[PDB]
Design an enzyme around this catalytic site. Structure first.
Site, PDB file in Angstrom:
ATOM      1  N   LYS A  13       0.823  -1.198   0.000  1.00 23.14           N
ATOM      2  CA  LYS A  13       0.000   0.000   0.000  1.00 23.14           C
ATOM      3  C   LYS A  13       0.872   1.269   0.000  1.00 23.14           C
ATOM      4  CE  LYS A  13      -2.256  -2.074   3.294  1.00 23.14           C
ATOM      5  NZ  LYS A  13      -3.016  -1.975   4.574  1.00 23.14           N
ATOM      6  N   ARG A  88     -10.305  -0.410   8.344  1.00 23.03           N
ATOM      7  CA  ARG A  88      -9.818  -1.778   8.665  1.00 23.03           C
ATOM      8  C   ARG A  88     -10.871  -2.668   9.266  1.00 23.03           C
ATOM      9  NH1 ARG A  88      -3.992  -0.933   8.273  1.00 23.03           N
ATOM     10  NH2 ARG A  88      -3.479  -3.124   8.685  1.00 23.03           N
ATOM     11  N   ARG A 127      11.565  -6.628   4.854  1.00 20.06           N
ATOM     12  CA  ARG A 127      11.550  -5.196   4.726  1.00 20.06           C
ATOM     13  C   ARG A 127      12.688  -4.561   5.523  1.00 20.06           C
ATOM     14  NH1 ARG A 127       6.150  -1.850   5.466  1.00 20.06           N
ATOM     15  NH2 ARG A 127       6.165  -2.867   7.523  1.00 20.06           N
ATOM     16  N   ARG A 160      11.451  -2.573  10.964  1.00 17.72           N
ATOM     17  CA  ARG A 160      10.371  -1.977  11.765  1.00 17.72           C
ATOM     18  C   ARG A 160      10.117  -2.901  12.989  1.00 17.72           C
ATOM     19  NH1 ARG A 160       4.895   0.007   8.549  1.00 17.72           N
ATOM     20  NH2 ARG A 160       3.907  -1.543   9.903  1.00 17.72           N
ATOM     21  N   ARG A 171      -0.466  -9.718  13.081  1.00 18.02           N
ATOM     22  CA  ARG A 171      -0.980  -8.725  12.121  1.00 18.02           C
ATOM     23  C   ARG A 171      -1.773  -9.400  11.027  1.00 18.02           C
ATOM     24  NH1 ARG A 171       4.285  -5.535  10.429  1.00 18.02           N
ATOM     25  NH2 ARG A 171       2.779  -4.460   9.063  1.00 18.02           N
TER      26      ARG A 171
HETATM   27  N1  AP5 Z   1       5.049  -5.383  -5.867  1.00 16.98           N
HETATM   28  C1  AP5 Z   1       5.985  -5.746  -4.973  1.00 16.98           C
HETATM   29  N2  AP5 Z   1       6.727  -6.834  -5.138  1.00 16.98           N
HETATM   30  C2  AP5 Z   1       7.660  -7.220  -4.247  1.00 16.98           C
HETATM   31  N3  AP5 Z   1       7.903  -6.555  -3.086  1.00 16.98           N
HETATM   32  C3  AP5 Z   1       7.196  -5.427  -2.822  1.00 16.98           C
HETATM   33  C4  AP5 Z   1       6.184  -4.976  -3.759  1.00 16.98           C
HETATM   34  N4  AP5 Z   1       5.597  -3.889  -3.227  1.00 16.98           N
HETATM   35  C5  AP5 Z   1       6.207  -3.627  -2.065  1.00 16.98           C
HETATM   36  N5  AP5 Z   1       7.150  -4.561  -1.809  1.00 16.98           N
HETATM   37  C6  AP5 Z   1       8.002  -4.659  -0.614  1.00 16.98           C
HETATM   38  O1  AP5 Z   1       7.153  -5.230   0.404  1.00 16.98           O
HETATM   39  C7  AP5 Z   1       7.402  -4.566   1.658  1.00 16.98           C
HETATM   40  C8  AP5 Z   1       6.109  -3.919   2.142  1.00 16.98           C
HETATM   41  O2  AP5 Z   1       5.719  -2.868   1.269  1.00 16.98           O
HETATM   42  P1  AP5 Z   1       4.928  -1.607   1.819  1.00 16.98           P
HETATM   43  O3  AP5 Z   1       4.567  -0.772   0.613  1.00 16.98           O
HETATM   44  O4  AP5 Z   1       5.656  -0.938   2.927  1.00 16.98           O
HETATM   45  O5  AP5 Z   1       3.592  -2.343   2.317  1.00 16.98           O
HETATM   46  P2  AP5 Z   1       2.380  -1.775   3.160  1.00 16.98           P
HETATM   47  O6  AP5 Z   1       1.177  -2.535   2.664  1.00 16.98           O
HETATM   48  O7  AP5 Z   1       2.389  -0.289   3.187  1.00 16.98           O
HETATM   49  O8  AP5 Z   1       2.881  -2.263   4.604  1.00 16.98           O
HETATM   50  P3  AP5 Z   1       2.243  -2.222   6.061  1.00 16.98           P
HETATM   51  O9  AP5 Z   1       1.357  -3.413   6.215  1.00 16.98           O
HETATM   52  O10 AP5 Z   1       3.396  -2.076   7.011  1.00 16.98           O
HETATM   53  O11 AP5 Z   1       1.312  -0.914   6.083  1.00 16.98           O
HETATM   54  P4  AP5 Z   1       1.465   0.394   7.046  1.00 16.98           P
HETATM   55  O12 AP5 Z   1       2.908   0.799   7.113  1.00 16.98           O
HETATM   56  O13 AP5 Z   1       0.442   1.314   6.425  1.00 16.98           O
HETATM   57  O14 AP5 Z   1       1.059   0.059   8.569  1.00 16.98           O
HETATM   58  P5  AP5 Z   1      -0.117  -0.942   8.972  1.00 16.98           P
HETATM   59  O15 AP5 Z   1      -1.325  -0.690   8.104  1.00 16.98           O
HETATM   60  O16 AP5 Z   1       0.459  -2.331   9.181  1.00 16.98           O
HETATM   61  O17 AP5 Z   1      -0.426  -0.213  10.345  1.00 16.98           O
HETATM   62  C9  AP5 Z   1       0.443  -0.471  11.415  1.00 16.98           C
HETATM   63  C10 AP5 Z   1      -0.377  -0.658  12.672  1.00 16.98           C
HETATM   64  O18 AP5 Z   1      -1.087   0.548  12.975  1.00 16.98           O
HETATM   65  C11 AP5 Z   1      -2.375   0.228  13.467  1.00 16.98           C
HETATM   66  N6  AP5 Z   1      -3.340   0.717  12.481  1.00 16.98           N
HETATM   67  C12 AP5 Z   1      -3.085   1.320  11.266  1.00 16.98           C
HETATM   68  N7  AP5 Z   1      -4.279   1.644  10.683  1.00 16.98           N
HETATM   69  C13 AP5 Z   1      -5.254   1.266  11.521  1.00 16.98           C
HETATM   70  C14 AP5 Z   1      -6.725   1.328  11.489  1.00 16.98           C
HETATM   71  N8  AP5 Z   1      -7.291   1.883  10.408  1.00 16.98           N
HETATM   72  N9  AP5 Z   1      -7.439   0.832  12.520  1.00 16.98           N
HETATM   73  C15 AP5 Z   1      -6.760   0.323  13.574  1.00 16.98           C
HETATM   74  N10 AP5 Z   1      -5.416   0.202  13.685  1.00 16.98           N
HETATM   75  C16 AP5 Z   1      -4.636   0.649  12.681  1.00 16.98           C
HETATM   76  C17 AP5 Z   1      -2.418  -1.279  13.669  1.00 16.98           C
HETATM   77  O19 AP5 Z   1      -1.888  -1.545  14.967  1.00 16.98           O
HETATM   78  C18 AP5 Z   1      -1.458  -1.727  12.588  1.00 16.98           C
HETATM   79  O20 AP5 Z   1      -0.949  -3.055  12.783  1.00 16.98           O
HETATM   80  C19 AP5 Z   1       8.537  -3.586   1.454  1.00 16.98           C
HETATM   81  O21 AP5 Z   1       9.735  -4.218   1.905  1.00 16.98           O
HETATM   82  C20 AP5 Z   1       8.546  -3.349  -0.063  1.00 16.98           C
HETATM   83  O22 AP5 Z   1       9.835  -3.058  -0.582  1.00 16.98           O
HETATM   84 MG    MG Z   2       2.053   0.888   4.978  1.00 15.17          MG
END
Ligand code: AP5
Ligand code: MG
Ligand code: ZN
Length: 214
Positions: A13, A88, A127, A160, A171
């Site tokens: 994302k 979410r 990552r 991270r 997660r």
């Molecule tokens: N096409 C491809 N092919 C190969 N490799 C690739 C690729 N695309 C990317 N990659 C690689 O893959 C990796 C990941 O890519 P990346 O682009 O970083 O993936 P991402 O989907 O953004 O990763 P996250 O799941 O960490 O999302 P986030 O940072 O927004 O935090 P989260 O939502 O977990 O939120 C964190 C926490 O916050 C809380 N939180 C956040 N939002 C809410 C909500 N709405 N409600 C409640 N709690 C929430 C929760 O506690 C949650 O766990 C990288 O190494 C990249 O290089």
């Molecule tokens: Mg993210």
């Protein structure tokens, strides 16, 4: 354009969001980034969020809705926005409809980036993030040119806190439980668009561009 990016943890994302804002000049609103920033401010909100985030649990709905409502009220969202990782839960999705109705807006698309669970585990554990500029790499799929250091400054790479295998496992379980409910909610609205996230980063983006072109 009023957009949501949805996807299980690690689905790409943030990667795609950066490319969407560079092309379309809409703001990137990531709840995860907002919670991490609150943690850095050391606010009561931040510290309360930290306890859930460290365990890989979702932050409770009401506080999450509240920071999103406030963020979407700003002048920079009047001509479009990109929500990333919100909603979410179905309760968050219903809240968002109310927030948008109050603003006189409608969602255009919920872009759901699909990647299998085993691949997501590796996306996260592999990552690496730049300590000094926040650039993101992946040991397999997007490695730095020089091991352990960022390409664009010379900064050390780090992992991270919540990308450890134990936390990643939780997660994935937490968010998988919420996925079918969310998909059904947005399919009913007719705004769900699925994207194959198991492609080169630029080919994922090409598919998103084709969608946003309409
Ligand atoms: N096409 C491809 N092919 C190969 N490799 C690739 C690729 N695309 C990317 N990659 C690689 O893959 C990796 C990941 O890519 P990346 O682009 O970083 O993936 P991402 O989907 O953004 O990763 P996250 O799941 O960490 O999302 P986030 O940072 O927004 O935090 P989260 O939502 O977990 O939120 C964190 C926490 O916050 C809380 N939180 C956040 N939002 C809410 C909500 N709405 N409600 C409640 N709690 C929430 C929760 O506690 C949650 O766990 C990288 O190494 C990249 O290089
Ligand atoms: Mg993210
Ligand atoms: Zn860097």
């Amino acid at each position: 354009m009023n957009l949501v990016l949805m996807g299980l943890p690690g689905a790409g994302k943030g990667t795609q969001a950066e490319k969407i804002v560079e092309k379309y000049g809409i703001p990137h609103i990531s709840t995860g980034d907002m919670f991490r920033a609150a943690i850095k401010e050391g606010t009561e909100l931040g510290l309360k969020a930290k306890s859930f985030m460290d365990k890989g649990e979702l932050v409770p709905d009401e506080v999450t809705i509240g920071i999103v409502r406030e963020r979407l009220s700003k002048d920079d969202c009047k001509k479009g926005f990109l929500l990333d990782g919100f909603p979410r839960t179905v309760a968050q999705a219903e809240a968002l409809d109310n927030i948008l109705s109050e603003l006189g807006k409608k969602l255009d698309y919920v872009i759901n980036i699909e990647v299998p669970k085993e691949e997501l585990m590796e996306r996260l554990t592999g990552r690496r993030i730049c300590k000094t500029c926040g650039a993101t790499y992946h040991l397999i799929f997007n490695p730095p040119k020089v091991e352990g250091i960022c390409d664009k400054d010379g900064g050390e790479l780090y992992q991270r806190a919540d990308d450890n295998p134990e936390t990643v496992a939780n997660r994935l379980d937490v968010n998988m439980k919420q996925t079918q409910p969310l998909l059904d909610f947005y399919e009913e609205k007719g705004v769900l668009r699925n994207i194959d996230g198991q492609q080169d980063i630029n080919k994922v983006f090409a598919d998103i561009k084709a969608l946003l072109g309409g």
